[PDB]
Amino acid sequence: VKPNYALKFTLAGHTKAVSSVKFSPNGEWLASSSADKLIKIWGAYDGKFEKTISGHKLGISDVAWSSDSNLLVSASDDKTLKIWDVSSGKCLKTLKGHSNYVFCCNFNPQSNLIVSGSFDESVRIWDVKTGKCLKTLPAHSDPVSAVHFNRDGSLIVSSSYDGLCRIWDTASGQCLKTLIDDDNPPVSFVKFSPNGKYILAATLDNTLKLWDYSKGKCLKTYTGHKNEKYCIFANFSVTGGKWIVSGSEDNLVYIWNLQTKEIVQKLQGHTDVVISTACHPTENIIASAALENDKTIKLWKSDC
Amino acid sequence: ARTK
């Protein structure tokens, strides 16, 4: 089986490179963030522009939804994160504490905590309600490219240009694991699988890898795309066939069969590097977003 | 920054 993603909508409006796209957990919305300092909300099913959320002083590198789809958190070159109430557009809290650009962010599953990674080479854990920093982890020795909570929130995974993936105990801040393979390329992205058994990691040598983090073993590698320069998001697609989805520096979306590692589809249309992709939580829908020469978001739908 |  192969999917049949087809272009349905193109979303224009950001005035600079798009940095991140994410579907709300309730499936209704797509949030996007951009070098243009803005967050935009769009209908997930019709691509219809909903609203703009503004307030950051500098470009935004990441945005993420709370579990109940009510809140967003964003990470900006202004060295802050902001927590937003989506329905009102209000900035509820500005999270101050990183000493350099904040590059990546996520809520835990209970959405009472936020994790962030920064060019300051740290990972910070923040209290959502009070907005105050609970823990700072001296996590890495180069900028932190990605941060993600596991399924119950007891662990954090981080990745860095230092070539390392690390797994942290949320409660204690202790480094429980360092993952690295036979080479030391910068690691540009990581996340836990939906079931929380695995970690998917991107490295800037054109490779994605699926790790059993419990065993410290690399189980699968995905190759064929181009990724040497940018921190490109990758995903597990689980609504239909089980795929791996990623952007690429050849302006395409790549889809692999998770088990076989064969490329099953490539999606053409963007005119610049596809920096970010996201997968709809219940429908076979992919959003993709491209860099400065393109500035658009595209929504693709498949029968499986 | 991601976009650079």
B1:A119 CB<8 A: yes
H or E stretch at A208: strand A207-212
Domains of chain A: 1-304 (2.130.10.10)
Q: What is the DSSP string of A228-291?
A: SSS---EEEE-SSS-EEEE--TTS-EEEEETTT--EEEEE---SS-EEEEEE-SSSSEEEEEE-
Beta-bridge partners for A53:
A39
Q: What is the DSSP string of A103-136?
A: EEEEE-TTSSEEEEEETTS-EEEEETTT--EEEE
Which of A18, A103, A292 is closest, CB to CB, to B1? A103
> Which has the closest alpha carbon to A291: A255, A251, A235?
A251
Q: Which of residues 278-297 of A touch B (CB under 8 A)?
A: 291-292
Beta-bridge partners for A300:
A7, A286
H or E stretch at A215: none
Q: Are A74 and B2 in contact (CB under 8 A)?
A: no
Cα A100 to Cα A62: distance, rounded to the nearest angstrom: 15
Beta-bridge partners for A167:
A157, A177
Q: Which tokens hold the place of A117? A: 């990674």
Q: What is the DSSP string of A37-81?
A: SEEEEEETTT--EEEEEE--SS-EEEEEE-TTSSEEEEEETTSEE
> Experimental technique used?
X-ray
